[PDB]
Amino acid sequence: NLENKTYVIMGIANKRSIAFGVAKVLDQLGAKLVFTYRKERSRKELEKLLEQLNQPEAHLYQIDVQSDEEVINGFEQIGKDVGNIDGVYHSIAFANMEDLRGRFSETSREGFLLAQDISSYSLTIVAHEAKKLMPEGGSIVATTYLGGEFAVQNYNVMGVAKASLEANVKYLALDLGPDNIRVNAISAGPIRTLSAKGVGGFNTILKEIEERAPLKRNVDQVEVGKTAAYLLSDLSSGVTGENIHVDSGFHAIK
Amino acid sequence: NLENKTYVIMGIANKRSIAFGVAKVLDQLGAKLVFTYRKERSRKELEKLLEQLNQPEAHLYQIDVQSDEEVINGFEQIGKDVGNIDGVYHSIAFANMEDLRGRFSETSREGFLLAQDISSYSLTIVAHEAKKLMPEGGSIVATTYLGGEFAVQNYNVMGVAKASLEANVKYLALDLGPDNIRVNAISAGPIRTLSAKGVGGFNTILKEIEERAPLKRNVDQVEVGKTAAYLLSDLSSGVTGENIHVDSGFHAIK
Amino acid sequence: NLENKTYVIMGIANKRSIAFGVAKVLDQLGAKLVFTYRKERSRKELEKLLEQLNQPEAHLYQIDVQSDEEVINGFEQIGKDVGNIDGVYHSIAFANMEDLRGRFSETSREGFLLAQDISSYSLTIVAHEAKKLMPEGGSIVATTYLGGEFAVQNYNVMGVAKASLEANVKYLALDLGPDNIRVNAISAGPIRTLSAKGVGGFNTILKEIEERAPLKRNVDQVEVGKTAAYLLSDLSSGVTGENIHVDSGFHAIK
Amino acid sequence: NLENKTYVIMGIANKRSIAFGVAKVLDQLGAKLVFTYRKERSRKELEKLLEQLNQPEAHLYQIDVQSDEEVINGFEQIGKDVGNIDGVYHSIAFANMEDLRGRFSETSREGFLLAQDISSYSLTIVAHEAKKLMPEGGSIVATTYLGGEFAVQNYNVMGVAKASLEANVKYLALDLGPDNIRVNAISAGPIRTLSAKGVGGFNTILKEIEERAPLKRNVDQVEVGKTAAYLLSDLSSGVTGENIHVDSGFHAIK
Ligand SMILES: NC(=O)c1ccc[n+]([C@@H]2O[C@H](COP(=O)([O-])OP(=O)(O)OC[C@H]3O[C@@H](n4cnc5c(N)ncnc54)[C@H](OP(=O)(O)O)[C@@H]3O)[C@@H](O)[C@H]2O)c1
Ligand SMILES: NC(=O)c1ccc[n+]([C@@H]2O[C@H](COP(=O)([O-])OP(=O)(O)OC[C@H]3O[C@@H](n4cnc5c(N)ncnc54)[C@H](OP(=O)(O)O)[C@@H]3O)[C@@H](O)[C@H]2O)c1
Ligand SMILES: NC(=O)c1ccc[n+]([C@@H]2O[C@H](COP(=O)([O-])OP(=O)(O)OC[C@H]3O[C@@H](n4cnc5c(N)ncnc54)[C@H](OP(=O)(O)O)[C@@H]3O)[C@@H](O)[C@H]2O)c1
Ligand SMILES: NC(=O)c1ccc[n+]([C@@H]2O[C@H](COP(=O)([O-])OP(=O)(O)OC[C@H]3O[C@@H](n4cnc5c(N)ncnc54)[C@H](OP(=O)(O)O)[C@@H]3O)[C@@H](O)[C@H]2O)c1
Ligand SMILES: N#Cc1cc(Br)ccc1Oc1ccc(Cl)cc1O
Ligand SMILES: N#Cc1cc(Br)ccc1Oc1ccc(Cl)cc1O
Ligand SMILES: N#Cc1cc(Br)ccc1Oc1ccc(Cl)cc1O
Ligand SMILES: N#Cc1cc(Br)ccc1Oc1ccc(Cl)cc1O
Ligand SMILES: N[C@@H](CCC(=O)O)C(=O)O
Ligand SMILES: N[C@@H](CCC(=O)O)C(=O)O
Ligand SMILES: N[C@@H](CCC(=O)O)C(=O)O
């Protein structure tokens, strides 16, 4: 039960975002929720989306994580508007589609550093900024994929940015541990989302989990958010630097 | 919230047992509990410990997991007394002191296999028998230690038995997954218990955690119980074949 | 270059044994070789496969690794016939078909313990006895498969025995380290051998390597031998407790 | 024996460089060696160090791996000068001490990307350009540290870059496999070099190896070279996407 908790959720794009999965779960559990979004263009659709929750007030902030200034100011404003927070769900990544298809050895320097910037480094800056709002400690969660642990076809530069994110999580957990801030990842199985259109052979991915994963089915955004609730609540009070696979068991098989 | 769930908790010896931390949590959340023990002396402790729980009824069964007969008849009697169950917590291990306190290369054959038998194989047969009382699906959790992933001083034959337990969890997840039975491990940090006395240098392991783990503190049995509640409940649907470290982040550092 | 080195090779049955590929490689490098066998039928293949080798002398010893006395007396006799040795290649496992070709959760106790006894514990007692023949250091290599680290279809009880075996290597590495005895594993890809017949769906494992592994081809026994040369030689002097995958990069993909 | 093979060795600054360890080993095995450097001062040191080697001529090229054109032109020029090569040893990393000597969560964006760029991405672009001199296949080896797998104190932004690098290796292995180009990492234990100076508490890392690693001693640059000879030669055919820890066992213990 998450009454009198406040969590910032970063990365809702539409009804299919894993982060709207997380949001519906935390909302039902009585958390006060704050949202960040990337582009002022899509604020309109995002307000409509959140009418579905039981949040009595919309707290929305434009933060594109390629800007220090936007993360610093955005979190500073959150603090003034809502006070101290209990945690952050990070659900954000990016690479150029044109890097993701064909040959990883052909990746450009710019495209490689972009995916690092948005998909890994953003966590670090967000943690430093969000720590200011968690004087008594709290919980940080980022979303990764099995590609950060193994070479998976077509995932290319994003795999290497996930490898990076996953270690980011570990170095943060160590750094912020003495402050009572826990930092974990959830490693989600494949789910149909906006950003999933940028991954070549997605249907073959989904298909294969159904065929081969221990549970013989794919997972969904609500299953991610239920593990997010665990990771963000006191239920997981002993757990940091961890990566939980919400992937129907697929990480465990070969 | 676990009203109308029933769980079987194997391996309480006293108030310090990790499994009694699990019981206190699940009892607090409303679950019906069933308990198994090997020694007479443990049944007597269990009768005393039950006065601190809300359990209106004392369901206790002697099960020495070295005996198929006892595991088989144990679980049969459970389904006869309480009906279908929702999961099993397995909190059982053993090894001879004289293997543990020698160099590993001197482990006796009968010692090595004794450790396998009680600490790993017991999970396999328990799962087979518990499966019969889980026609709708369910969840099974076993307790491991970090010495099954790495070589730790003084842990010797138990390390190799936990390496076996951890694979046993994964093979079980794969097998039972289509039956909607999830199988997971919790890798607990060092906790002072009766059996912790068989681990040479134990106080030193404790101090290392306080000094070096992200959270700079040790964990306790209620904290294992809280992760156990997540794994035995529907919050962790989609998670199987997983090993969740409740160890203050110590697994993530080196 | 292993001139004036002596190695003991355990587990040749015929021309397709991985251990025979080890032999061909260490023989080509000038090593003096000693072979151990279980069935008198394997001693007859060894006498025939010897003609193929440069070995001027046959050094052949019956050692069933289920018998302490056979391992003890075998290695003592090796010592008396050839003097101190430089290392041991262990290429030995077993499980019953009846356990292997069932659901893993249906595994028998005696079959589970048989598979641990021959496939894991055998290493620990061989290391202990072999150590008396390595008073100034040496190398011990055992053979494992990816099914030790992941739940692989059809591999069942042998997956748990390989998990055990891989921890055995780490614990042995840690114990025997200060004696300058290194202990490592080779994780071989699927190779068609006599024992391969005991893995269900083995043909479909071979073909999956060809299509999905980075090198897009299956390995052979000579490739395992070449990596065993490295591990068993001064080339790998600061390497210990390690698992080397000789599998065309299959371990690294999902 | 690497007679009539040619290897490009990137990252020698002085006698203590790990890459000079590679160089001595391969030069001793009869390989033709080409060397790349960044600072003119490193070139001068290469000219002196060459006197110790068997190399009958100096093949030195300036390649700052931050520069696409310097990588592209350096390798092209290498092909014209010596022809086709057999592989590359990459021994290059960098980060600012002002990001390294402060909390991880305080890392600057530009510092984070700097270390990714020099320490991880350089491998990708080196592979793409070096593939052009390997029509026949070959071997590429990069140098990493355990800090890429675990959160180690003081290593901070370099550990996230080594994590990126180890995933880079796996993805390069999958991408260049069908070209018969193998791609691997060596995980070296701590060695006194010039860059070691950038790691806070380096002396306390050295001594922990001695006290705790299985072999109870630190390793040196020649041991790295010895495993590099194995990865770069036909002995490790079958081996790709892998990370060999040349670290006296340390990775296997907790
Ligand atoms: N779907 C899967 O199968 C899967 C599996 C495992 C992990 N994940 C991970 O889960 C997370 C969410 O992905 P998703 O599938 O839910 O897709 P999604 O709905 O498209 O969400 C991705 C979000 O990232 C935001 N974003 C991208 N760049 C940003 C920037 N510079 N600043 C702020 N926000 C930015 C996007 O904003 P805009 O729409 O405004 O661009 C979008 O809201 C990602 O980390 C992804 O890598 C996904
Ligand atoms: N304490 C730690 O720091 C630590 C850390 C990580 C993991 N673990 C694991 O946590 C689990 C619980 O251990 P613990 O520390 O809580 O110690 P504990 O209180 O001593 O419990 C050990 C239990 O194992 C039972 N047991 C042993 N052999 C049995 C058999 N043949 N049949 C049925 N029960 C048997 C004992 O029952 P009887 O007394 O009646 O014989 C006892 O209840 C174990 O798997 C242990 O390896 C412990
Ligand atoms: N083939 C593969 O795809 C593959 C892949 C990965 C790992 N491996 C591993 O490689 C190793 C060798 O297997 P292989 O494929 O070469 O098969 P193999 O040629 O059939 O050899 C297996 C050997 O095990 C010996 N052995 C079994 N039980 C023994 C006992 N109780 N005492 C003494 N020796 C015993 C057998 O000897 P007898 O015939 O005299 O009884 C036989 O020589 C095994 O550890 C296996 O698990 C194989
Ligand atoms: N020493 C250790 O304990 C240790 C342990 C594990 C891994 N490693 C790794 O081993 C590799 C070599 O380090 P080391 O200890 O041998 O130190 P080193 O002797 O100081 O070598 C580092 C090399 O990196 C080069 N370099 C830095 N930035 C470059 C750039 N932009 N372009 C071209 N070259 C660049 C330097 O060249 P210039 O001087 O000419 O700039 C130098 O030759 C690194 O990847 C390091 O992470 C070291
Ligand atoms: N967010 C996001 C995202 C961006 C790109 Br471009 C590619 C994939 C993205 O999310 C995923 C979707 C699907 C999978 Cl399987 C993994 C992901 O990381
Ligand atoms: N149960 C149990 C158990 C039995 C022996 Br003998 C040795 C250790 C046991 O439990 C643990 C206690 C402490 C630690 Cl750190 C790990 C454990 O596995
Ligand atoms: N030795 C041996 C062995 C015995 C049985 Br029963 C089953 C498999 C055995 O070796 C393998 C054959 C094939 C593979 Cl893929 C892995 C192995 O461990
Ligand atoms: N090359 C390099 C390098 C540069 C910086 Br700045 C920091 C460390 C570097 O090398 C290492 C030295 C020592 C260790 Cl233990 C690890 C390393 O990766
Ligand atoms: N440290 C003592 C006491 C045992 C324990 O720590 O549990 C020993 O080495 O046996
Ligand atoms: N797949 C067949 C053939 C056995 C084998 O592949 O070795 C089976 O289950 O027996
Ligand atoms: N430990 C000192 C010296 C650095 C080193 O060990 O290289 C520091 O933190 O800077």
Side-chain angles (χ1 to χ4, degrees), chain C residues 47 49 55 60 74 92 104 126 160 177 190-191 200 206 223 235 239-240:
Chain C
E47 294 159 23
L49 297 161
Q55 298 304 288
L60 308 179
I92 291 174
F104 172 65
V126 160
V160 185
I191 302 168
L206 277 172
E223 295 188 288
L235 265 190
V239 174
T240 194

PDB file of all heavy atoms in Angstrom, chain C residues 47 49 55 60 74 92 104 126 160 177 190-191 200 206 223 235 239-240:
ATOM      1  N   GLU C  47      44.145 -48.909 -26.555  1.00  0.00           N
ATOM      2  CA  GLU C  47      45.288 -49.599 -27.175  1.00  0.00           C
ATOM      3  C   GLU C  47      45.359 -49.387 -28.690  1.00  0.00           C
ATOM      4  O   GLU C  47      46.447 -49.247 -29.241  1.00  0.00           O
ATOM      5  CB  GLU C  47      45.303 -51.097 -26.864  1.00  0.00           C
ATOM      6  CG  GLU C  47      45.544 -51.409 -25.403  1.00  0.00           C
ATOM      7  CD  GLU C  47      45.057 -52.789 -25.015  1.00  0.00           C
ATOM      8  OE1 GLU C  47      44.937 -53.668 -25.897  1.00  0.00           O
ATOM      9  OE2 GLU C  47      44.803 -53.001 -23.812  1.00  0.00           O
ATOM     10  N   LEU C  49      43.772 -46.669 -30.373  1.00  0.00           N
ATOM     11  CA  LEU C  49      43.972 -45.239 -30.672  1.00  0.00           C
ATOM     12  C   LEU C  49      45.412 -44.789 -30.402  1.00  0.00           C
ATOM     13  O   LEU C  49      45.909 -43.886 -31.063  1.00  0.00           O
ATOM     14  CB  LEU C  49      42.954 -44.331 -29.964  1.00  0.00           C
ATOM     15  CG  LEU C  49      41.463 -44.482 -30.307  1.00  0.00           C
ATOM     16  CD1 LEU C  49      40.628 -43.862 -29.211  1.00  0.00           C
ATOM     17  CD2 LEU C  49      41.059 -43.926 -31.679  1.00  0.00           C
ATOM     18  N   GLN C  55      53.029 -41.413 -28.683  1.00  0.00           N
ATOM     19  CA  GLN C  55      53.416 -41.986 -27.396  1.00  0.00           C
ATOM     20  C   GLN C  55      54.252 -43.235 -27.592  1.00  0.00           C
ATOM     21  O   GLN C  55      53.758 -44.212 -28.151  1.00  0.00           O
ATOM     22  CB  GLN C  55      52.195 -42.362 -26.558  1.00  0.00           C
ATOM     23  CG  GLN C  55      51.308 -41.188 -26.187  1.00  0.00           C
ATOM     24  CD  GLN C  55      52.070 -40.099 -25.469  1.00  0.00           C
ATOM     25  OE1 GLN C  55      52.451 -40.245 -24.308  1.00  0.00           O
ATOM     26  NE2 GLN C  55      52.253 -38.975 -26.143  1.00  0.00           N
ATOM     27  N   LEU C  60      48.312 -47.043 -19.053  1.00  0.00           N
ATOM     28  CA  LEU C  60      46.853 -47.186 -19.023  1.00  0.00           C
ATOM     29  C   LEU C  60      46.349 -47.670 -17.671  1.00  0.00           C
ATOM     30  O   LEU C  60      46.836 -48.660 -17.155  1.00  0.00           O
ATOM     31  CB  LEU C  60      46.363 -48.161 -20.100  1.00  0.00           C
ATOM     32  CG  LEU C  60      46.817 -47.960 -21.543  1.00  0.00           C
ATOM     33  CD1 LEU C  60      46.224 -49.048 -22.449  1.00  0.00           C
ATOM     34  CD2 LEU C  60      46.478 -46.556 -22.034  1.00  0.00           C
ATOM     35  N   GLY C  74      44.947 -45.870  -8.237  1.00  0.00           N
ATOM     36  CA  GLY C  74      45.297 -45.485  -9.598  1.00  0.00           C
ATOM     37  C   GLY C  74      46.352 -44.396  -9.641  1.00  0.00           C
ATOM     38  O   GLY C  74      47.350 -44.508 -10.361  1.00  0.00           O
ATOM     39  N   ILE C  92      34.544 -36.661 -17.943  1.00  0.00           N
ATOM     40  CA  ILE C  92      33.788 -37.782 -17.354  1.00  0.00           C
ATOM     41  C   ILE C  92      32.468 -37.273 -16.774  1.00  0.00           C
ATOM     42  O   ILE C  92      32.467 -36.357 -15.954  1.00  0.00           O
ATOM     43  CB  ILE C  92      34.608 -38.508 -16.234  1.00  0.00           C
ATOM     44  CG1 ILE C  92      35.825 -39.272 -16.797  1.00  0.00           C
ATOM     45  CG2 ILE C  92      33.720 -39.464 -15.430  1.00  0.00           C
ATOM     46  CD1 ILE C  92      36.749 -39.871 -15.694  1.00  0.00           C
ATOM     47  N   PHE C 104      12.241 -33.122 -15.638  1.00  0.00           N
ATOM     48  CA  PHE C 104      13.231 -32.940 -14.581  1.00  0.00           C
ATOM     49  C   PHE C 104      12.631 -33.080 -13.185  1.00  0.00           C
ATOM     50  O   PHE C 104      13.291 -33.560 -12.268  1.00  0.00           O
ATOM     51  CB  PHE C 104      13.916 -31.570 -14.674  1.00  0.00           C
ATOM     52  CG  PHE C 104      14.790 -31.270 -13.489  1.00  0.00           C
ATOM     53  CD1 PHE C 104      15.933 -32.033 -13.238  1.00  0.00           C
ATOM     54  CD2 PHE C 104      14.397 -30.329 -12.552  1.00  0.00           C
ATOM     55  CE1 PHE C 104      16.650 -31.858 -12.083  1.00  0.00           C
ATOM     56  CE2 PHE C 104      15.193 -30.076 -11.437  1.00  0.00           C
ATOM     57  CZ  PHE C 104      16.295 -30.862 -11.187  1.00  0.00           C
ATOM     58  N   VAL C 126      39.686 -36.666  -7.515  1.00  0.00           N
ATOM     59  CA  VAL C 126      40.793 -36.663  -8.474  1.00  0.00           C
ATOM     60  C   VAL C 126      41.822 -35.544  -8.200  1.00  0.00           C
ATOM     61  O   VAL C 126      43.029 -35.809  -8.065  1.00  0.00           O
ATOM     62  CB  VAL C 126      40.225 -36.594  -9.936  1.00  0.00           C
ATOM     63  CG1 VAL C 126      41.263 -36.103 -10.925  1.00  0.00           C
ATOM     64  CG2 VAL C 126      39.704 -37.955 -10.363  1.00  0.00           C
ATOM     65  N   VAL C 160      21.963 -29.841 -13.612  1.00  0.00           N
ATOM     66  CA  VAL C 160      22.272 -29.644 -12.203  1.00  0.00           C
ATOM     67  C   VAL C 160      23.648 -30.214 -11.845  1.00  0.00           C
ATOM     68  O   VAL C 160      24.316 -29.612 -11.042  1.00  0.00           O
ATOM     69  CB  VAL C 160      21.196 -30.251 -11.303  1.00  0.00           C
ATOM     70  CG1 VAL C 160      21.472 -29.923  -9.831  1.00  0.00           C
ATOM     71  CG2 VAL C 160      19.800 -29.799 -11.756  1.00  0.00           C
ATOM     72  N   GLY C 177      44.825 -23.154  -5.247  1.00  0.00           N
ATOM     73  CA  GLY C 177      45.587 -21.918  -5.533  1.00  0.00           C
ATOM     74  C   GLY C 177      46.927 -21.772  -4.813  1.00  0.00           C
ATOM     75  O   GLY C 177      47.969 -21.639  -5.465  1.00  0.00           O
ATOM     76  N   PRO C 190      28.014 -28.556 -28.476  1.00  0.00           N
ATOM     77  CA  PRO C 190      27.656 -29.951 -28.769  1.00  0.00           C
ATOM     78  C   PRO C 190      28.539 -30.592 -29.839  1.00  0.00           C
ATOM     79  O   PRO C 190      28.756 -30.015 -30.918  1.00  0.00           O
ATOM     80  CB  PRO C 190      26.212 -29.858 -29.248  1.00  0.00           C
ATOM     81  CG  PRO C 190      26.065 -28.453 -29.714  1.00  0.00           C
ATOM     82  CD  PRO C 190      26.959 -27.603 -28.857  1.00  0.00           C
ATOM     83  N   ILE C 191      29.072 -31.763 -29.497  1.00  0.00           N
ATOM     84  CA  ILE C 191      29.894 -32.572 -30.386  1.00  0.00           C
ATOM     85  C   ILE C 191      29.332 -34.005 -30.451  1.00  0.00           C
ATOM     86  O   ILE C 191      28.914 -34.539 -29.437  1.00  0.00           O
ATOM     87  CB  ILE C 191      31.344 -32.577 -29.901  1.00  0.00           C
ATOM     88  CG1 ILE C 191      31.890 -31.150 -29.836  1.00  0.00           C
ATOM     89  CG2 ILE C 191      32.207 -33.408 -30.850  1.00  0.00           C
ATOM     90  CD1 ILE C 191      33.209 -31.058 -29.089  1.00  0.00           C
ATOM     91  N   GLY C 200      18.367 -36.076 -25.417  1.00  0.00           N
ATOM     92  CA  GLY C 200      17.238 -35.841 -26.332  1.00  0.00           C
ATOM     93  C   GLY C 200      17.427 -34.658 -27.273  1.00  0.00           C
ATOM     94  O   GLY C 200      18.004 -33.633 -26.913  1.00  0.00           O
ATOM     95  N   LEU C 206      22.692 -29.337 -32.422  1.00  0.00           N
ATOM     96  CA  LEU C 206      23.750 -29.122 -33.404  1.00  0.00           C
ATOM     97  C   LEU C 206      23.351 -28.059 -34.416  1.00  0.00           C
ATOM     98  O   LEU C 206      24.122 -27.143 -34.711  1.00  0.00           O
ATOM     99  CB  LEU C 206      24.030 -30.410 -34.175  1.00  0.00           C
ATOM    100  CG  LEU C 206      24.971 -31.417 -33.504  1.00  0.00           C
ATOM    101  CD1 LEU C 206      24.950 -32.691 -34.343  1.00  0.00           C
ATOM    102  CD2 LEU C 206      26.423 -30.914 -33.242  1.00  0.00           C
ATOM    103  N   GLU C 223      39.298 -28.660 -31.261  1.00  0.00           N
ATOM    104  CA  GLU C 223      39.252 -27.279 -30.782  1.00  0.00           C
ATOM    105  C   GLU C 223      39.263 -27.246 -29.251  1.00  0.00           C
ATOM    106  O   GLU C 223      39.914 -26.380 -28.641  1.00  0.00           O
ATOM    107  CB  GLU C 223      38.095 -26.489 -31.408  1.00  0.00           C
ATOM    108  CG  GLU C 223      38.296 -26.344 -32.938  1.00  0.00           C
ATOM    109  CD  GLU C 223      37.308 -25.414 -33.602  1.00  0.00           C
ATOM    110  OE1 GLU C 223      36.143 -25.819 -33.712  1.00  0.00           O
ATOM    111  OE2 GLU C 223      37.678 -24.280 -34.011  1.00  0.00           O
ATOM    112  N   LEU C 235      50.976 -21.067 -20.543  1.00  0.00           N
ATOM    113  CA  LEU C 235      50.399 -19.932 -21.234  1.00  0.00           C
ATOM    114  C   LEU C 235      49.296 -19.336 -20.366  1.00  0.00           C
ATOM    115  O   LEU C 235      48.929 -18.175 -20.504  1.00  0.00           O
ATOM    116  CB  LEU C 235      49.791 -20.330 -22.589  1.00  0.00           C
ATOM    117  CG  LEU C 235      50.486 -20.236 -23.945  1.00  0.00           C
ATOM    118  CD1 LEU C 235      49.430 -20.491 -25.013  1.00  0.00           C
ATOM    119  CD2 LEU C 235      51.227 -18.911 -24.196  1.00  0.00           C
ATOM    120  N   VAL C 239      45.495 -17.705 -14.790  1.00  0.00           N
ATOM    121  CA  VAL C 239      44.087 -17.984 -15.041  1.00  0.00           C
ATOM    122  C   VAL C 239      43.644 -19.149 -14.156  1.00  0.00           C
ATOM    123  O   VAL C 239      44.274 -20.202 -14.133  1.00  0.00           O
ATOM    124  CB  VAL C 239      43.876 -18.350 -16.539  1.00  0.00           C
ATOM    125  CG1 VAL C 239      42.443 -18.797 -16.843  1.00  0.00           C
ATOM    126  CG2 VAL C 239      44.222 -17.163 -17.449  1.00  0.00           C
ATOM    127  N   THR C 240      42.578 -18.980 -13.389  1.00  0.00           N
ATOM    128  CA  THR C 240      42.155 -20.069 -12.517  1.00  0.00           C
ATOM    129  C   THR C 240      40.731 -19.785 -12.088  1.00  0.00           C
ATOM    130  O   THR C 240      40.320 -18.623 -12.067  1.00  0.00           O
ATOM    131  CB  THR C 240      43.140 -20.339 -11.362  1.00  0.00           C
ATOM    132  OG1 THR C 240      42.832 -21.591 -10.754  1.00  0.00           O
ATOM    133  CG2 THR C 240      43.164 -19.234 -10.314  1.00  0.00           C
TER     134      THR C 240
END
